[PDB]
Design an enzyme around this catalytic site. Structure first.
Site, PDB file in Angstrom:
ATOM      1  N   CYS A 178       0.830  -1.222   0.000  1.00  0.00           N
ATOM      2  CA  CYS A 178       0.000   0.000   0.000  1.00  0.00           C
ATOM      3  C   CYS A 178       0.870   1.282   0.000  1.00  0.00           C
ATOM      4  O   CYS A 178       0.701   2.143  -0.874  1.00  0.00           O
ATOM      5  CB  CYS A 178      -1.018   0.054   1.148  1.00  0.00           C
ATOM      6  SG  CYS A 178      -0.336   0.041   2.778  1.00  0.00           S
ATOM      7  N   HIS A 238      -3.496   1.111   6.396  1.00  0.00           N
ATOM      8  CA  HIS A 238      -3.511   1.134   4.928  1.00  0.00           C
ATOM      9  C   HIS A 238      -3.521   2.555   4.427  1.00  0.00           C
ATOM     10  O   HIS A 238      -3.868   3.465   5.165  1.00  0.00           O
ATOM     11  CB  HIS A 238      -4.784   0.361   4.457  1.00  0.00           C
ATOM     12  CG  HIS A 238      -4.948   0.124   2.982  1.00  0.00           C
ATOM     13  ND1 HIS A 238      -4.016  -0.587   2.251  1.00  0.00           N
ATOM     14  CD2 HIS A 238      -6.001   0.403   2.184  1.00  0.00           C
ATOM     15  CE1 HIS A 238      -4.493  -0.650   1.014  1.00  0.00           C
ATOM     16  NE2 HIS A 238      -5.683  -0.061   0.928  1.00  0.00           N
ATOM     17  N   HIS A 250      -5.277   2.123  -4.923  1.00  0.00           N
ATOM     18  CA  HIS A 250      -4.472   1.546  -3.864  1.00  0.00           C
ATOM     19  C   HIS A 250      -3.988   0.178  -4.271  1.00  0.00           C
ATOM     20  O   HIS A 250      -4.479  -0.373  -5.270  1.00  0.00           O
ATOM     21  CB  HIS A 250      -5.282   1.450  -2.537  1.00  0.00           C
ATOM     22  CG  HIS A 250      -6.528   0.586  -2.587  1.00  0.00           C
ATOM     23  ND1 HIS A 250      -6.907  -0.179  -1.485  1.00  0.00           N
ATOM     24  CD2 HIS A 250      -7.488   0.476  -3.541  1.00  0.00           C
ATOM     25  CE1 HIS A 250      -8.080  -0.723  -1.800  1.00  0.00           C
ATOM     26  NE2 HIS A 250      -8.463  -0.375  -3.033  1.00  0.00           N
TER      27      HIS A 250
HETATM   28 CL   LIG Z   1      -7.946  -1.185   6.523  1.00  0.00          CL
END
Ligand SMILES: [Cl-]
Ligand SMILES: [Cl-]
Ligand SMILES: [Cl-]
Ligand SMILES: [Cl-]
Lengths: 303, 304
Positions: A178, A238, A250
């Protein structure tokens, strides 16, 4: 403690794999690229190195070229050929039907040694000589002069990475996690920010997202995790890049577009429920600790 | 315990997926599987435990494989594929390489063939995505199978195209390879599957006791390194390379490179020469011994 002749180093493979410990059976923590300067912290058979984002990790001794400060500064001063395509190869001859020297990925940088036909003659930190196509790379001076570092340009690069696999600690066009997606896209625009999502969350301006998302702009980062309570501070798990219209790009399984709107087929229920805040960081490159360009980064300069 | 019928099988739907020791990212990678590769699904915990066509097992995140019933799995396997033959490339939304990409691809990736347009093949992913892939980096499975060479010379030619590619622990694709992963990546571009671990590759094919002058070792033989057997301990296999003749071998260590057993050569590898144990001749025994096969003879690719 490091001997003077090996206090510094330069990565000499397209992508090297930095681990938590000096052994292959330890988790990968990040990746560094061909031509990237590093500080050498220790040697045990493996090197503990420090990359220009101040991240530390271990690599096998055969993937970096150790150097004195003098040779390291000389490498950094030399005008580079910057690889701009996601994937490619270098060749022994200025002919793409000749034997290859190595693969390359975007962000790789090699010493410019000349030109022949449609190729640039280049050299590796270890001394290998090769040729690279002008169609996948360009001289550092030319590249720096035409560079765009605005949200639209960064989003254009992010879309070229759609479908690329997720890889834990992945920090190259080969595969990204990420925070590694953010770093890979930004490095193709000469920008370095912190490696971990937990550290990217506290650089730039924090944006408290309005219910209708009206105060979030394209190029902002969106952060997800555990919301702060009176008993516990927030936890960052994230990150994604905001695209406007409640959509974000993402890395999760692969690089893809998701949405906070349940009308969209790409609605991400789990991450929508864990959305914490956004950050506006692109206006503050070279204006805040931990966010810089390589010609402003002290690992790339004599000091 | 078996899986529910609708999720007993699966197909990898990303260029390269990363199989781990446990169902979590903070566990070590053990091997990698490729786009379009059929797998058996062993369990589901939020992650899938899968079994690849080399019988190796490992864990992947739920979002990288398409689970299927036996019926849909057999349908995927029957469909003629487009086989990716170049190390790296992309697929596109349109038959135009200036259009938006759908994903990266690596050699050995296989997608369902859905037609042709200009210089492109129309393809579909196991998850249902549609794309276009250049004819210059891929070919239809029937034409590919018909032109395939599986001799030592052709396999060495492919190995040389991987020089300089980085070493990656458990790496099993053109993106990065470990010592046994190099052998597997090169062999898969020739439709061949052998065991994943170096310690298992060491005991398939014919074991060759290397003569001091290497006169009984042939191009295409594998060379194995490790701890020599003693009266108290059996040999231990730690590394593998591909023999090139003239006391040279190609292997993955730091990166893919050529090394030599001869101290007169510039690329002499003293450490690995000292730990050379034996060679194996395996290319004559594909589809003639358990664990060595081609994908059109591998039961994961066929109805059974
Ligand atoms: Cl998350
Ligand atoms: Cl992963
Ligand atoms: Cl590695
Ligand atoms: Cl060894």
């Amino acid at each position: 403690p490091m001997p003077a002749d090996s206090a510094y180093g330069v990565v000499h493979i397209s992508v090297c794999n930095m681990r938590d410990e000096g052994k292959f059976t330890s988790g990968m923590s990040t990746q560094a690229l061909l031509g990237m300067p590093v500080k050498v912290l220790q040697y045990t058979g493996w090197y503990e190195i420090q990359t220009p984002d101040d991240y530390t990790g271990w690599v096998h001794r055969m993937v970096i070229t150790p150097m004195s400060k003098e040779k390291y500064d000389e490498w950094n001063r030399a005008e580079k050929i910057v690889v701009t395509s996601h994937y490619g190869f270098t060749y022994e001859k200025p002919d793409d039907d000749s034997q290859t020297v190595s693969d390359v990925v975007a962000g790789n940088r090699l010493k410019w040694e000349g030109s022949k036909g449609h190729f640039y003659k280049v050299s590796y930190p270890d001394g290998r000589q090769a040729y690279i196509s002008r169609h996948i790379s360009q001289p550092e001076s030319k590249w720096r002069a035409s560079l765009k570092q605005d949200a639209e340009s960064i989003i254009k690069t992010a879309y070229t990475m759609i479908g690329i696999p997720y890889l834990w600690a992945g920090t190259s066009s080969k595969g990204v996690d990420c925070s590694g997606l953010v770093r890979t896209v930004l490095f193709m625009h000469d920008i370095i920010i912190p490696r971990d999502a937990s550290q990217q969350a506290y650089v730039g301006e924090r944006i408290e997202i309005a219910p209708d998302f009206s105060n979030v702009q394209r190029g902002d980062l969106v952060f997800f995790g555990r919301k702060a309570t009176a008993d516990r501070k927030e936890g960052i798990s994230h990150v994604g890049i905001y695209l406007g219209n409640k959509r974000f790009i993402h890395a999760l399984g692969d690089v893809h577009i998701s949405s906070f709107d349940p009308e969209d087929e790409c609605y991400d229920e789990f991450n929508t429920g864990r959305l914490l805040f956004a950050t506006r960081f692109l206006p503050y490159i070279n204006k805040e600790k931990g966010m810089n360009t390589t010609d402003h980064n002290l690992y790339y300069l004599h000091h």
